[PDB]
């Protein structure tokens, strides 16, 4: 490559893997969202919450891909596994799944940051710090807040609490 | 002092003590507020309510300090004790703590007013009446109204009631 | 904690300590400011300069507290010691005290950054770099510039120079 | 009187005396102001400062007179003594004279407040507290601040300091 500079093959490959993780996440969120749009689930605010996350994760993938090209790496795509479930249970079940999923993304970001630090790649580290790490922390805090709220509600009365959360928070 | 007139040493000292009480109150409210921002508490409206009070109590301190200088007194600061608790329980527990705290401020204002009256210091009495005493009465009435509402709600169903109060009142 | 991830107990505690330092700084600035509002000191621009810093340091504390909760740490408050002086001398004395104080904050930030780096906590490092470290460098440069200006003025004629600095710089 | 109620003859007379004091003050300020407009004094900002005070003291007299009629008292005017000096010296001399004068007004207000309190006349006490006592405290604090500034300046270099104060403060 005529532009590549200080960009290890290890980081290049890890970036491609992270793209696959972000796209898998996006896919998982599309499934979550449309589950809550089922007529026998019917929680619009929950559907919208997950559809917005699907979009966000796709935008994350796109940012990674743009950076891969900026650095002179080569994007390589792999098969995308389907989401882990076909049906996602109640709102708390779904919110717990989402936090698991985000923590896995976040750990993948931390791992890539560590690789970048080992490879002495400050551009990578800046990119991740600026566009991903705080966004993940903020998102996970929001999900934890949601989970606490939903649990407090459905602990009182499950159906009623699920409705109220969807109406008054989402 | 070239400006001091009719300003007793007793009032000067009591004003400094009251500043310490207002700053301690402010500190207590900062703690309350950030407690309700914990991911395992997660009541945004409660956090905002207490953060706003922290600001209000700081503004009270500042007004006292401005008056101390206007009268030719000398501000003296003391150590500020930490708030009485590290964790503040449920919304009713916190609202009860806040009313205790405000009643203590109010009693300190009444005591200073009484001292001013004994010292024949009408400027002090006017200052307190105009900027503090009605504000405290209004605030305590609001807190009592909140407490009644929260108690009525959590008496019905604790988790659900706490959510609804935070969503629909705060 | 349901959200905490890669957030050491060492960093959690150091963040709480830093909050105490920022609040102590805020308190020191409140004292500085109201000193310069005394009728026998009477330098409005100096009072405003320090009152604005008091606000800034409080905002720093608040940002730290928000981050502590975002990461799933638990804010813990300690007693706040009173400022180091009751009276703050002339403008150069006060500006020197402020630079001492800011350098101590800055060293505490650098120490926390070093701890974060040792704990492999890139989110912490980004947070500090983005919201604190440059702000401190900029502030210290401004204070140094002020001190040089005040010293040059009061070296010529003390009273006159102090007035002119307050009128024409602040 | 068809409207007079709870308005003692003692307060009525003291109000008339206070009017004479406010008008005497106004007269003193007119003299101060025009002194600083002399071609051999020539401090415009000082002239404006005192001319504005002359207006303020006249407005005070007018407010007292309006209140005297509101209560069913009868305004009685006495001769107005000329100001204590024909020439008023330097800016610090003049500012010291003004603070003496304001402290005398303030003591007269406090004395009338005390009389009102002894006569159980809450309307009088409210009137004084609301329209006079804080205004006097604020004014005296401003004068003290000015005096400190002027003294610091003329202690450095008298002529130069007097000019700078007039240009940059007034």
XYZ file of C-alpha atoms in Angstrom:
680
model
C 0.000 0.000 0.000
C 1.113 3.450 -0.903
C -0.397 5.032 2.268
C -0.041 2.328 4.974
C 2.171 3.441 7.834
C 2.483 2.025 11.310
C -0.517 -0.237 10.729
C 0.137 -3.778 11.811
C -1.328 -6.844 10.203
C -2.563 -7.852 13.678
C -4.604 -4.681 14.053
C -5.858 -4.944 10.436
C -7.212 -8.441 11.124
C -8.667 -7.499 14.529
C -10.497 -4.573 12.870
C -12.072 -6.959 10.361
C -13.171 -9.215 13.223
C -14.618 -6.269 15.073
C -16.602 -5.297 12.001
C -18.108 -8.806 11.975
C -19.028 -8.362 15.694
C -20.675 -4.978 15.075
C -22.634 -6.348 12.107
C -23.692 -9.401 14.187
C -24.825 -6.960 16.907
C -26.781 -4.953 14.371
C -28.462 -8.172 13.213
C -29.330 -9.134 16.789
C -30.937 -5.745 17.325
C -32.962 -6.020 14.119
C -34.333 -9.291 15.489
C -35.048 -7.813 18.870
C -36.822 -4.893 17.368
C -39.077 -6.822 15.089
C -39.901 -9.258 17.938
C -41.367 -6.388 19.911
C -43.381 -5.364 16.847
C -45.225 -8.734 16.834
C -48.931 -8.352 17.431
C -48.667 -10.712 20.448
C -45.778 -8.659 21.982
C -46.744 -5.151 20.872
C -44.371 -2.855 22.701
C -43.665 -0.048 20.225
C -41.196 1.840 22.386
C -39.132 -1.322 22.892
C -39.143 -2.017 19.144
C -37.971 1.532 18.472
C -35.230 1.302 21.112
C -33.739 -1.831 19.507
C -34.219 -0.640 15.901
C -32.267 2.506 16.789
C -29.482 0.328 18.248
C -29.394 -1.759 15.101
C -28.742 1.461 13.190
C -26.080 2.565 15.664
C -24.195 -0.706 15.399
C -24.299 -0.531 11.605
C -22.867 2.995 11.803
C -20.114 1.597 14.066
C -19.260 -1.001 11.461
C -19.170 1.625 8.773
C -16.820 3.821 10.834
C -14.486 0.868 11.335
C -14.513 0.114 7.616
C -13.795 3.773 6.739
C -10.843 3.721 9.205
C -9.550 0.408 7.799
C -9.344 2.067 4.350
C -7.911 5.304 5.759
C -5.024 3.316 7.212
C -4.458 1.265 4.065
C -5.842 -1.982 5.433
C -8.134 -4.194 3.490
C -11.658 -4.934 4.566
C -12.530 -8.601 4.554
C -16.030 -9.805 5.293
C -17.054 -13.129 6.803
C -20.346 -14.947 7.157
C -22.639 -13.345 9.747
C -24.115 -15.666 12.248
C -27.779 -15.320 13.051
C -28.845 -13.943 16.394
C -28.726 -16.236 19.425
C -32.509 -16.426 19.853
C -35.599 -16.355 17.645
C -37.866 -15.047 20.443
C -36.672 -12.700 23.110
C -39.082 -13.091 26.050
C -40.131 -10.130 28.134
C -38.640 -6.627 28.224
C -36.256 -7.474 31.123
C -35.056 -10.609 29.292
C -34.380 -8.531 26.200
C -32.631 -5.715 28.123
C -30.390 -8.297 29.858
C -29.519 -9.798 26.434
C -28.688 -6.333 25.144
C -26.367 -5.597 28.091
C -24.603 -8.968 27.557
C -24.195 -8.068 23.921
C -22.854 -4.562 24.617
C -20.420 -5.823 27.239
C -19.081 -8.281 24.632
C -18.579 -5.373 22.149
C -16.958 -3.333 24.822
C -14.585 -6.134 25.746
C -13.711 -6.502 22.027
C -12.960 -2.736 21.907
C -10.801 -2.973 25.021
C -8.968 -5.940 23.536
C -8.318 -4.030 20.305
C -7.156 -1.019 22.280
C -4.722 -3.264 24.174
C -3.464 -4.693 20.862
C -3.000 -1.172 19.532
C -1.106 -0.158 22.621
C 1.175 -3.281 22.233
C 1.691 -2.367 18.534
C 2.415 1.301 19.446
C -0.451 2.493 17.154
C -1.659 5.812 18.691
C -3.951 6.572 15.785
C -5.926 3.368 16.475
C -6.031 4.108 20.172
C -7.341 7.685 19.541
C -9.924 6.407 17.065
C -11.323 3.899 19.558
C -11.234 6.293 22.473
C -12.918 9.072 20.484
C -15.634 7.134 18.606
C -16.342 3.936 20.559
C -15.265 3.579 24.172
C -17.288 6.430 25.688
C -20.247 5.684 23.510
C -20.252 2.105 24.864
C -19.906 3.205 28.459
C -22.811 5.681 28.040
C -24.997 3.036 26.330
C -24.314 0.382 28.954
C -25.133 2.872 31.759
C -28.451 3.687 30.014
C -29.268 -0.061 29.651
C -28.419 -0.687 33.306
C -30.710 2.201 34.295
C -33.460 0.731 32.080
C -32.999 -2.734 33.546
C -33.219 -1.424 37.088
C -36.424 0.449 36.180
C -38.002 -2.537 34.419
C -37.109 -4.917 37.230
C -38.585 -2.611 39.813
C -41.770 -2.379 37.749
C -42.272 -6.025 36.877
C -41.450 -7.029 40.415
C -44.572 -5.081 41.398
C -46.971 -6.375 38.617
C -45.474 -7.865 35.433
C -47.853 -6.900 32.659
C -48.719 -3.483 34.028
C -45.065 -2.685 34.704
C -43.987 -3.635 31.217
C -46.625 -1.369 29.722
C -45.758 1.558 31.964
C -42.046 1.325 31.172
C -42.718 1.272 27.458
C -45.143 4.209 27.702
C -43.308 6.456 30.180
C -39.577 5.764 29.647
C -39.267 4.619 26.021
C -14.298 48.525 59.454
C -15.053 51.721 57.674
C -18.641 50.653 56.764
C -19.785 48.463 59.707
C -22.767 49.930 61.513
C -25.188 48.271 63.874
C -23.722 44.854 63.081
C -23.030 42.846 66.184
C -20.236 40.362 66.583
C -22.892 37.820 67.631
C -24.746 38.156 64.344
C -21.456 38.136 62.372
C -20.496 34.796 63.942
C -23.994 33.309 63.564
C -23.926 34.246 59.852
C -20.650 32.365 59.419
C -22.182 29.336 61.142
C -25.224 29.538 58.928
C -23.007 29.579 55.861
C -21.413 26.331 57.082
C -24.945 24.838 57.499
C -26.004 25.885 53.988
C -22.800 24.479 52.478
C -23.270 21.221 54.461
C -26.843 21.089 53.096
C -25.577 21.628 49.575
C -23.118 18.761 50.087
C -25.873 16.485 51.390
C -27.958 17.227 48.315
C -25.049 16.513 45.974
C -24.799 13.100 47.631
C -28.501 12.491 47.402
C -28.568 13.420 43.788
C -25.726 11.252 42.682
C -27.156 8.318 44.703
C -30.273 8.423 42.568
C -28.088 8.473 39.451
C -26.580 5.057 40.358
C -27.397 2.397 37.809
C -28.979 0.260 40.579
C -31.198 3.188 41.770
C -31.858 4.956 38.467
C -34.467 7.567 39.256
C -33.542 10.532 37.052
C -36.254 12.867 38.287
C -35.183 12.294 41.898
C -31.539 12.959 41.000
C -32.542 16.192 39.279
C -34.694 17.287 42.228
C -31.783 16.931 44.679
C -29.147 18.367 42.303
C -31.325 21.467 41.925
C -31.531 21.747 45.735
C -27.775 21.455 46.012
C -27.544 24.468 43.706
C -30.167 26.371 45.687
C -28.367 25.827 48.972
C -25.085 26.971 47.435
C -26.842 30.125 46.216
C -28.122 30.624 49.789
C -24.588 30.421 51.108
C -23.411 32.886 48.525
C -26.179 35.352 49.445
C -25.192 35.106 53.104
C -21.547 35.715 52.243
C -22.433 38.742 50.070
C -24.507 40.153 52.986
C -21.694 39.482 55.490
C -19.393 41.662 53.335
C -22.091 44.285 52.733
C -22.376 44.757 56.487
C -18.622 44.838 57.065
C -18.382 41.431 58.698
C -15.709 38.964 57.868
C -16.429 35.609 56.334
C -14.756 32.725 58.091
C -14.963 29.203 56.751
C -14.802 25.971 58.728
C -14.378 22.337 57.786
C -17.483 20.878 56.125
C -18.677 17.638 57.504
C -19.660 14.927 55.081
C -23.292 14.009 54.665
C -24.921 11.802 57.298
C -25.327 8.784 55.005
C -23.496 7.209 52.074
C -26.649 5.527 50.693
C -30.059 7.060 50.948
C -32.561 4.190 50.611
C -35.805 4.624 48.741
C -37.453 7.839 47.538
C -39.563 8.218 50.734
C -36.457 7.714 52.908
C -34.651 10.390 50.930
C -37.601 12.835 50.996
C -37.884 12.388 54.793
C -34.128 13.110 55.127
C -34.555 16.223 53.008
C -37.438 17.512 55.162
C -35.357 16.897 58.333
C -32.534 18.814 56.735
C -34.726 21.743 55.644
C -36.397 21.986 59.041
C -32.911 22.227 60.598
C -32.033 25.106 58.186
C -35.295 26.761 58.932
C -34.752 26.514 62.669
C -31.258 28.020 62.173
C -32.863 30.915 60.223
C -35.451 31.440 62.951
C -32.711 31.402 65.571
C -30.705 33.997 63.634
C -33.809 36.116 63.195
C -34.381 35.970 66.964
C -30.746 36.988 67.554
C -31.175 39.877 65.135
C -34.325 40.983 66.871
C -32.473 40.854 70.286
C -29.597 42.878 68.731
C -32.074 45.390 67.193
C -30.676 44.691 63.665
C -33.606 45.389 61.263
C -31.448 45.027 58.183
C -30.644 41.411 59.144
C -34.267 40.703 59.916
C -35.395 42.120 56.506
C -32.688 40.168 54.690
C -33.787 36.873 56.238
C -37.473 37.551 55.802
C -37.040 38.602 52.165
C -34.564 35.973 50.897
C -34.845 32.919 53.164
C -37.852 32.432 55.413
C -40.571 32.251 52.751
C -38.386 30.262 50.444
C -37.938 27.667 53.220
C -41.624 27.540 54.030
C -42.480 27.050 50.319
C -39.812 24.327 49.923
C -40.895 22.431 53.026
C -44.556 22.534 51.872
C -43.484 21.112 48.474
C -41.460 18.321 50.196
C -44.388 17.488 52.477
C -46.666 17.287 49.421
C -44.107 15.019 47.708
C -43.797 12.803 50.767
C -47.549 12.405 51.040
C -47.704 11.469 47.339
C -44.814 8.997 47.555
C -46.184 7.368 50.691
C -49.582 6.942 49.130
C -47.954 5.353 46.083
C -45.517 3.005 47.771
C -48.167 1.955 50.235
C -50.032 0.571 47.216
C -47.041 -1.166 45.426
C -43.485 -0.048 46.263
C -41.542 -0.388 43.039
C -44.356 0.670 40.747
C -45.213 3.641 42.957
C -41.649 4.873 43.054
C -41.447 4.765 39.276
C -44.759 6.538 38.786
C -43.836 9.350 41.173
C -40.537 9.915 39.426
C -42.180 9.865 35.982
C -45.358 11.861 36.670
C -44.453 14.331 39.456
C -40.700 14.919 39.110
C -22.724 -4.075 39.594
C -24.585 -5.009 36.493
C -22.666 -2.498 34.290
C -19.136 -2.371 35.801
C -16.490 -3.547 33.366
C -12.761 -3.018 33.445
C -13.102 -0.575 36.337
C -10.651 -1.284 39.098
C -11.270 -0.681 42.757
C -8.041 1.366 42.778
C -9.353 3.768 40.157
C -12.786 3.910 41.864
C -11.154 5.009 45.130
C -8.771 7.461 43.426
C -11.773 9.060 41.666
C -13.482 9.587 45.022
C -10.305 11.194 46.369
C -10.073 13.422 43.339
C -13.645 14.551 43.879
C -12.683 15.590 47.425
C -9.711 17.567 45.965
C -11.909 19.336 43.398
C -14.500 20.211 46.052
C -11.717 21.470 48.384
C -10.441 23.589 45.464
C -13.914 24.958 44.867
C -14.119 25.876 48.561
C -10.735 27.607 48.431
C -11.887 29.665 45.465
C -15.119 30.657 47.206
C -12.962 31.989 50.040
C -10.637 33.790 47.698
C -13.483 35.379 45.879
C -15.310 36.669 48.878
C -12.014 37.990 50.338
C -11.648 40.263 47.341
C -15.238 41.428 47.836
C -14.393 42.809 51.321
C -14.827 46.551 51.534
C -11.167 46.891 52.642
C -9.915 44.800 49.647
C -12.449 45.794 46.989
C -11.139 44.305 43.778
C -14.264 43.242 41.878
C -12.480 41.710 38.911
C -10.375 39.537 41.226
C -13.486 38.411 43.118
C -15.164 37.496 39.837
C -12.092 35.606 38.603
C -12.023 33.385 41.713
C -15.820 32.954 41.921
C -15.771 31.694 38.328
C -13.017 29.211 39.271
C -15.043 28.007 42.224
C -17.828 27.202 39.765
C -15.423 25.487 37.376
C -14.010 23.254 40.085
C -17.512 22.300 41.212
C -18.341 21.382 37.607
C -15.166 19.244 37.571
C -16.339 17.406 40.655
C -19.724 16.851 39.118
C -18.173 15.438 35.926
C -16.091 13.028 37.995
C -19.157 11.920 39.935
C -21.162 11.392 36.714
C -18.267 9.271 35.331
C -17.995 7.275 38.582
C -21.675 6.287 38.164
C -21.307 5.678 34.421
C -18.607 3.119 35.171
C -20.539 1.463 37.992
C -18.396 2.808 40.807
C -19.823 4.198 43.962
C -19.363 7.778 45.009
C -18.188 8.200 48.565
C -17.852 11.610 50.147
C -15.471 12.645 52.912
C -15.204 15.681 55.143
C -13.990 18.775 53.278
C -11.197 20.632 54.882
C -11.422 24.388 55.050
C -9.172 26.501 52.886
C -5.557 26.991 53.959
C -5.945 30.695 54.771
C -8.647 33.023 56.078
C -7.129 36.119 54.408
C -5.348 35.995 51.113
C -3.095 39.080 50.986
C -2.569 40.997 47.784
C -3.474 39.988 44.225
C -0.016 38.443 43.544
C -0.216 36.435 46.793
C -3.627 35.147 45.775
C -2.567 34.336 42.182
C 0.465 32.406 43.516
C -1.855 30.441 45.861
C -4.133 29.668 42.933
C -1.242 28.372 40.794
C -0.060 26.166 43.710
C -3.577 24.850 44.012
C -3.971 24.157 40.278
C -0.596 22.440 40.062
C -1.717 20.154 42.918
C -4.932 19.296 40.968
C -2.933 18.733 37.866
C -0.519 16.424 39.645
C -3.530 14.498 41.045
C -4.887 14.166 37.466
C -1.516 12.963 36.200
C -1.326 10.468 39.047
C -4.805 9.146 38.236
C -3.903 8.931 34.567
C -0.811 6.899 35.499
C -2.971 4.606 37.660
C -5.388 4.177 34.770
C -2.570 3.358 32.415
C -1.234 0.730 34.948
C -4.790 -0.707 35.236
C -5.188 -0.732 31.409
C -8.337 1.481 31.667
C -8.473 3.435 28.350
C -11.885 4.880 29.092
C -10.499 6.603 32.216
C -7.476 7.830 30.323
C -9.682 9.296 27.513
C -12.004 10.915 30.047
C -9.131 12.676 31.810
C -7.391 13.680 28.617
C -10.601 15.030 27.071
C -12.166 16.871 30.040
C -9.364 17.745 32.475
C -5.742 17.700 31.375
C -5.902 20.372 28.664
C -8.240 22.493 30.686
C -5.677 22.485 33.528
C -2.781 23.294 31.244
C -4.739 26.217 29.705
C -5.768 27.524 33.158
C -2.258 27.321 34.584
C -0.855 29.171 31.525
C -3.471 31.928 32.041
C -2.570 32.189 35.778
C 1.142 32.344 34.959
C 0.434 35.126 32.444
C -1.619 36.957 35.102
C 1.106 36.550 37.705
C 3.749 37.906 35.363
C 1.513 40.910 34.603
C 0.700 41.585 38.263
C 4.323 41.266 39.330
C 5.448 43.657 36.650
C 2.794 46.134 37.782
C 3.270 45.962 41.530
C 7.012 46.069 41.103
C 6.467 49.537 39.626
C 3.917 50.893 42.238
C 1.949 48.401 44.364
C -1.439 49.991 44.892
C -1.687 51.581 41.470
C -0.564 48.379 39.758
C -3.102 46.261 41.574
C -5.888 48.602 40.532
C -4.779 48.734 36.912
C -4.575 44.947 36.627
C -8.046 44.532 38.054
C -9.472 47.236 35.770
C -7.680 46.437 32.498
C -7.066 42.655 32.544
C -9.826 41.207 34.744
C -57.935 62.532 60.031
C -60.407 60.258 58.398
C -57.735 57.671 57.395
C -55.129 57.814 60.215
C -54.823 54.523 62.054
C -52.066 53.287 64.303
C -49.880 56.252 63.365
C -48.341 57.897 66.376
C -47.569 61.563 66.689
C -43.994 60.546 67.582
C -43.514 58.727 64.292
C -45.234 61.560 62.362
C -42.750 64.081 63.781
C -39.734 61.788 63.290
C -40.755 61.328 59.628
C -40.784 65.100 59.145
C -37.317 65.309 60.701
C -36.078 62.543 58.464
C -37.367 64.400 55.429
C -35.294 67.420 56.512
C -32.220 65.112 56.814
C -32.763 63.623 53.345
C -33.219 67.080 51.809
C -30.071 68.327 53.627
C -28.237 65.279 52.214
C -29.503 66.059 48.739
C -28.227 69.628 49.142
C -24.821 68.395 50.302
C -24.567 66.176 47.241
C -25.514 69.021 44.903
C -22.608 70.965 46.397
C -20.242 68.058 46.095
C -21.184 67.488 42.529
C -20.781 71.017 41.355
C -17.432 71.271 43.215
C -16.068 68.489 41.051
C -17.351 70.314 37.966
C -15.106 73.339 38.725
C -12.518 73.924 36.043
C -9.748 73.659 38.688
C -11.115 70.291 39.992
C -12.472 68.791 36.769
C -13.391 65.238 37.652
C -16.523 64.529 35.604
C -17.129 61.030 36.917
C -16.997 62.293 40.509
C -19.435 65.105 39.687
C -21.812 62.599 38.111
C -21.544 60.228 41.084
C -22.574 62.961 43.549
C -25.245 64.495 41.277
C -26.858 61.055 41.022
C -26.815 60.789 44.838
C -28.426 64.192 45.145
C -31.257 62.856 42.989
C -31.499 59.661 45.029
C -31.771 61.536 48.305
C -34.473 63.787 46.864
C -36.382 60.673 45.776
C -36.005 59.365 49.353
C -37.531 62.545 50.703
C -40.374 62.299 48.256
C -41.081 58.682 49.261
C -41.188 59.710 52.915
C -43.576 62.551 52.128
C -45.854 60.243 50.092
C -45.901 57.782 53.048
C -46.606 60.587 55.549
C -49.744 61.463 53.529
C -50.694 57.808 53.021
C -50.782 57.376 56.790
C -52.699 60.596 57.417
C -49.795 62.527 58.886
C -49.034 66.064 57.971
C -45.846 67.094 56.270
C -44.103 70.007 57.906
C -41.016 71.569 56.396
C -38.206 73.350 58.217
C -35.320 75.518 57.106
C -32.586 73.535 55.341
C -29.121 74.137 56.548
C -26.401 74.606 53.987
C -23.811 71.912 53.484
C -20.964 71.639 55.989
C -18.260 72.763 53.548
C -17.951 75.096 50.567
C -14.986 73.186 49.070
C -14.597 69.469 49.357
C -10.881 68.731 48.853
C -9.725 65.678 46.968
C -11.741 62.628 45.901
C -10.864 60.655 49.086
C -11.875 63.627 51.270
C -15.186 63.828 49.445
C -15.825 60.052 49.593
C -15.116 60.083 53.361
C -17.601 62.981 53.774
C -20.181 61.027 51.801
C -19.754 57.916 53.980
C -20.110 60.069 57.143
C -23.254 61.535 55.672
C -24.745 58.158 54.697
C -23.960 56.636 58.081
C -25.835 59.557 59.689
C -28.878 58.847 57.430
C -28.646 55.204 58.215
C -28.526 55.849 61.942
C -31.598 58.118 61.560
C -33.393 55.255 59.733
C -32.425 52.788 62.452
C -33.636 55.216 65.099
C -36.974 55.632 63.313
C -37.278 51.879 62.939
C -36.687 51.508 66.690
C -39.355 54.156 67.371
C -41.755 52.309 65.089
C -41.056 49.052 66.839
C -41.708 50.767 70.265
C -44.969 52.227 68.843
C -45.978 48.806 67.399
C -46.239 50.317 63.858
C -45.493 47.398 61.457
C -46.404 49.406 58.389
C -43.632 51.921 59.185
C -41.173 49.147 59.880
C -41.997 47.415 56.528
C -41.747 50.710 54.653
C -38.274 51.425 56.028
C -37.041 47.888 55.581
C -38.340 47.687 52.004
C -37.362 51.128 50.640
C -34.472 52.441 52.755
C -32.442 50.110 54.942
C -31.054 47.808 52.242
C -30.534 50.663 49.868
C -28.381 52.385 52.522
C -26.392 49.266 53.282
C -25.717 48.718 49.541
C -24.712 52.384 49.047
C -22.384 52.435 52.042
C -20.700 49.197 50.851
C -20.166 50.789 47.402
C -18.681 53.959 49.011
C -16.390 51.871 51.215
C -15.224 49.955 48.126
C -14.621 53.281 46.336
C -12.713 54.698 49.289
C -10.483 51.650 49.498
C -9.771 51.933 45.754
C -9.066 55.674 45.886
C -6.824 55.344 48.924
C -4.832 52.591 47.304
C -4.415 54.753 44.203
C -3.521 58.060 45.806
C -1.173 56.322 48.185
C 0.813 55.357 45.081
C 0.737 58.790 43.245
C -1.967 61.324 44.178
C -2.796 63.133 40.965
C -2.414 60.135 38.692
C -4.452 57.940 41.032
C -7.293 60.413 41.231
C -7.480 60.590 37.454
C -7.383 56.829 37.011
C -10.163 56.258 39.541
C -12.382 58.809 37.862
C -11.682 57.364 34.401
C -11.789 53.623 35.145
C -14.245 53.212 38.058
C -16.645 56.165 37.784
